């Protein structure tokens, strides 16, 4: 119905409410990184730090988790009455973890000979650290009241499709 009009500097409503979709990717970094546990001790403590949040979920029935994706994809990415600064961050956090999932599946598909070896763990520690710090920097960008233009996929993949 509105929005247009379009703001100049976003208030702290959206600054707080738009970085929520970075929660599950923040806590889902270590799912396929157990091979790097032989390399970095902090990955052990990160697991037990994210355990309370993964325990918070589950008491909510699975339909909530299965419908969150559809609600985000066709309640915020549709129609115009929503800030373009906030829906952008929603689509930022909604399929940032799809790349992580794809990497996970291509990792499991590979044989265990090269996964647990000295190459798989060295690949996965770097992947996990880079992904975690990317998520943290996206959170910082959201808190700063500006977009999060990650180099390769952000602009095109997440500005073309969420147009309505």
């Amino acid at each position: 119905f509105r929005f247009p009009p379009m703001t100049k500097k976003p208030q702290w409503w959206w600054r707080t409410l738009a970085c929520l979709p970075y929660l599950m990717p923040l806590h889902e970094t270590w799912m396929y990184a157990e091979t790097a546990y032989h390399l970095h001790p902090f990955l052990e403590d990160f697991e037990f730090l994210t355990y309370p949040f993964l325990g918070a979920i589950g008491r909510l029935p699975s339909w909530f988790l299965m419908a969150y994706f559809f609600v985000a994809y066709l309640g915020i990415v549709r129609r115009k009455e929503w800030p373009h600064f906030f829906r952008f961050h929603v689509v930022m956090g909604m399929l940032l973890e799809i790349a992580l999932q794809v990497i996970g599946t291509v990792s499991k598909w590979m044989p265990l000979g090269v996964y647990w070896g000295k190459f798989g763990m060295h690949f996965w520690t770097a992947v996990a650290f880079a992904y975690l710090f990317t998520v943290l920097e996206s959170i910082r960008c959201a808190l700063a009241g500006m977009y999060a233009d990650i180099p390769f996929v952000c602009d095109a993949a997440y500005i073309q499709i969420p147009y309505d």
């Binding site: 702290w12 600054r15 707080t16 970085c19 929520l20 918070a56 808190l143 700063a144 009241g145």
Partner: protein, 95 residues
């Protein structure tokens, strides 16, 4: 010009204070913070603050006791200890 930047950064201040008010801390903090806020300047201010300085004046009182109970404690500890020869009963039986 400091006023402008301060009024910009206060927005981010409220931003992340509410952000980490709305994390796992938020899930146990429904109970915790709701109790804390529904009588802000009220019951929690007068009940939880007491528990807050309980630890403070606590280790103050322990340091005071260390001041006061360090005079002859070793003497009485040695006297009130049974051995092959000495015992508190023997001491207190005959002056």
């Amino acid at each position: 010009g400091i006023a402008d930047e301060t009024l910009q950064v206060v927005l981010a201040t409220l931003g992340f204070i509410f952000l980490y008010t709305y994390i796992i801390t938020g899930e146990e903090l429904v109970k915790l913070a709701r109790d804390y806020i529904r009588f802000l300047m009220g019951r929690p201010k007068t009940v939880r603050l007491t528990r807050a300085m309980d630890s403070w004046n606590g280790f103050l009182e322990k340091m005071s006791r260390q001041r006061v109970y360090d005079e002859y404690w070793l003497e009485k500890a040695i006297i009130n200890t049974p051995t092959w020869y000495d015992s508190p009963e023997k001491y207190r039986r005959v002056i």
